[PDB]
Amino acid sequence: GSMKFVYKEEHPFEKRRSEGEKIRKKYPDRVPVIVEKAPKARIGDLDKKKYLVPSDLTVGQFYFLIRKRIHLRAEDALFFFVNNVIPPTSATMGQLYQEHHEEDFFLYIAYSDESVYGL
Amino acid sequence: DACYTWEVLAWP
Ligand SMILES: *Cc1ccccc1C*
Ligand SMILES: [Cl-]
Ligand SMILES: [Cl-]
Ligand SMILES: [Cl-]
Ligand SMILES: [Cl-]
Ligand code: NA
After folding, report:
1. H or E element: which one contains A75?
2. For position A22, which CATH number holds?
C-alpha cells in the first residue's frame, strides 16, 4: 500500500529475500533487522538501516544501542514498534525475529519519539 | 565481504 516501509519501497521482494536467505546462512547466530524512523516521528535520523543483531540480545540492550546512534538527549523519549506494537521487554531480538520476520527473512522495526506509531 | 552494507551490533 501507500503506507509501506521505505526499504520495501526501494528494494523488490525477490531481491530482498535472496539477501535475507544469504545473510541468515552466513551468520546464523545473528538476525538481520531493518530499522527505520516512523513516518510522523520528530526525532533524529540513523546513519544506516541494516543491522545484524545477536539473537541473544535483549530488547532493552537493543534499545540502548540504537539510542546512542541517534544521539538522543536524556530528556528525549524513544519507542520501538514491530507491526505497530511495542515489543515486550522480556523478548530477545532472536525471539522477535523468529516470531515476526517477513517472507524476505528480514525483521522490520520502527522507532519514534511517540508511544503510538505514526501519531 | 557480504557485509559492506550491514552494521554488526554487539553488547560488551
Ligand atoms: C557481517 C560482518 C562480517 C564481518 C565483519 C563485520 C560484519 C558486520
Ligand atoms: Cl510495510
Ligand atoms: Cl520481486
Ligand atoms: Cl556502540
Ligand atoms: Cl543528555
Ligand atoms: Na522471552
Report:
1. none
2. 3.10.20.90
Q: Rg of the Cα trace of chain B? A: 9
| Method by which the coordinates were obtained | X-ray
Q: Which of A29, A47, A52, A53 to mutate to test the pocket of ligand 1 (most atoms within 8 A of CB)?
A: A52
The total of structural domains in chain A comes to 1
Dig out the grid coordinates for A77 from the structure: 523519549
Domain that holds residue A58: 6-112
Is A92 within a domain?
yes
Residue A1 within a domain: no
Resolution to one decimal, Å: 1.5
B12 C-alpha to center of ligand 2: Å?
33
Domain-located, residue A84: yes
Q: Where are the alpha helices (DSSP H) in chain A?
A: 6-10, 13-26, 59-70, 93-100
Instruction: Answer whether A41's CB lies under 8 Å from A109's CB.
Output: no
Cβ pair A52, B3 in contact under 8 A? yes
Q: Measured between CA atoms, how close is B11 to chain A, in angstroms?
A: 7
